[PDB]
């Protein structure tokens, strides 16, 4: 920060709930805990300009966990192809996806 | 079968409203050294139906200065909220089991104000607007105390669920721990619902029937039965919270019966109070309910925060 009075005195008024992997009230993990932890543990000691390209894989995995865009694309593609095939009459959905399965437990 | 449940929850409440009107008139009569209705039925058990039918045969008033949209929509909202408030009520097993029932009640009532407050504006007239602003003042007065009272009371229950109060009161009532909170809750239920001595919105001698002076027919009837439904609701809330009846898992109808008894007692108490006292002033109500009730309310909230701790009586989260 501008005036690191917290680091001066060792207190944490606000710098302990800065992100997701940070002390949820009872120990319930937020989603992308692992991804954010890994990104942050890569980007430590480094600052900025070097972390933005030496810790890019981990940030990209985090971004896909949180915003989760490529899985939307993947399922949308699978669904679109399925609808095309069912319209053409090529695909035949099974019982365990039409609503008739043997429940496991 | 859920729709049959809706029936068994809704139609008897409406008959209860209708006969509460009769009970009000007759109790006020006998307190006033007279007999109320005893003509139209054997002992006047048809006057409510007569009033309803006659009100729905009268021509409604659509004035010229009015805003017809809010005008027609306000009684709708009034009755809808009065009738949705009965939904989570555990008597003992509710129709809709919510985890934040008291917040549902609070928000529903704070929205029920807007029926008065939009009908008064839409009905373009003076006494109408007077009633609306008096409703604003009334709500400003009572809402804070209602919330903090209810907080302090449930601070020994452990949740906002209404059904947990039954187990909180398995061996005792919450009236002996909190009779002061119960007093103030009662008088805030009396300020809510616009019931005497805190009427101050249809104050026939100050205003000429505020927020209903331009309403004649079934709309006015809707406002009427909304009021007389909220009365029974608030008595039901007081007797679920403080006057906890006996659950007895094998005998739940016992809970329902004792609930009936206590709710009737507290409603008759509302009517009694109408008959006994004169009306407050809507600034004297503020002075009362800020300068006497809110200090003691905050002090007793501090007390009820301390009390689970220094007694090792912190309740459970389910």
């Amino acid at each position: 920060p501008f005036l690191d009075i917290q680091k001066k005195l060792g207190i944490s008024l606000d710098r302990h709930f800065m992100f997701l992997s940070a002390e949820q009230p009872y120990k319930n993990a937020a989603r992308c805990h692992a991804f954010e932890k890994e990104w942050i543990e890569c980007a430590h000691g480094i600052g900025g300009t070097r972390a933005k390209k030496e810790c890019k894989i981990e940030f990209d995995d985090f971004e896909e966990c949180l915003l989760r865009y490529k899985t939307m694309r993947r399922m949308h593609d699978i669904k679109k192809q399925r609808e095309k095939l069912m319209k053409e009459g090529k695909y035949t959905p099974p019982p365990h996806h039409s609503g008739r399965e043997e429940p496991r437990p | 079968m859920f729709f049959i449940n809706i029936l068994t929850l809704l139609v008897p409440i409406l008959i209860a409203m209708a006969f509460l009107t009769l009970v009000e008139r007759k109790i006020l009569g006998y307190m006033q050294l007279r007999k109320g209705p005893n003509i139209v039925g054997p002992y006047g058990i048809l006057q409510p139906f007569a009033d309803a039918m006659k009100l729905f045969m009268k021509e409604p008033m659509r004035p010229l200065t009015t805003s017809m949209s809010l005008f027609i929509i306000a009684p709708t909202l009034s009755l809808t909220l009065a009738l949705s408030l009965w939904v989570p009520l555990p008597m003992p097993h509710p129709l809709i089991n919510l985890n934040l029932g008291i917040l549902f009640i609070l928000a529903t009532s704070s929205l029920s104000v807007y029926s008065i407050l939009w009908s008064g504006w839409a009905s373009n007239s003076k006494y109408s607007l007077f009633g609306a602003l008096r409703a604003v003042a009334q709500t400003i007065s009572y809402e804070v105390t209602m919330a903090i009272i209810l907080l302090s009371v449930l601070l020994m229950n452990g949740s906002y669920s209404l059904q947990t109060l039954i187990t909180t009161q398995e061996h005792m009532w919450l009236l002996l721990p909190a009779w002061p909170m119960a007093m103030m809750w009662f008088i805030s239920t009396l300020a809510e619902t616009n019931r005497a001595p805190f009427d101050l919105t249809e104050g026939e001698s100050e205003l000429v029937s505020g927020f209903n002076v331009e309403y004649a027919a079934g709309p006015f009837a809707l406002f009427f039965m909304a009021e007389y439904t909220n009365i029974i609701l608030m008595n039901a809330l007081t007797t679920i919270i403080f006057l906890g009846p006996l659950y007895y898992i094998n005998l739940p109808e016992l809970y329902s019966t004792n609930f009936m008894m206590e709710a009737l007692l507290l409603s008759s108490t509302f009517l009694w109070i109408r008959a006994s006292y004169p009306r407050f002033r809507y600034d004297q109500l503020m002075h009362l309910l800020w300068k006497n009730f809110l200090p003691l309310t905050l002090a007793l909230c501090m007390w009820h925060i301390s009390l689970p701790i220094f007694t090792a009586g912190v309740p459970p989260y389910m």
Partner: protein, 98 residues
């Protein structure tokens, strides 16, 4: 979720467009500010519930607190404006140019 976040951001933008593009009254501007507050609240709350970040859930209550204090002082200024000019209009406030 992306749909509703888009819609909520467009709602914020509409309320911002509103409070920028003035009309005669000022109360309407204050209400547009309240609407922006509300959309921001819902965005924060939905992000927190999605991510299951119960550590950030104290943020929207703070938003409501400070926004209501903002509304309070705005309404007090409105009381003063009416006591001066009488009619709430923002066109009467045109004497600091000179």
């Amino acid at each position: 979720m992306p749909s509703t976040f888009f819609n909520l951001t467009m709602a914020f933008s509409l309320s911002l467009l509103g409070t920028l593009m003035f009309r005669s009254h000022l109360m309407s501007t204050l209400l547009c500010l309240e609407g922006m507050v509300l959309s921001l609240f819902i965005m924060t709350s939905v992000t927190s519930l999605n991510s299951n970040s119960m550590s950030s859930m104290p943020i929207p209550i703070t938003i409501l607190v400070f926004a209501a204090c903002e509304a309070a002082v705005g309404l007090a200024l409105l009381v003063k404006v009416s006591n001066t000019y009488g009619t709430d209009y923002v066109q009467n406030l045109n004497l600091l140019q000179c």
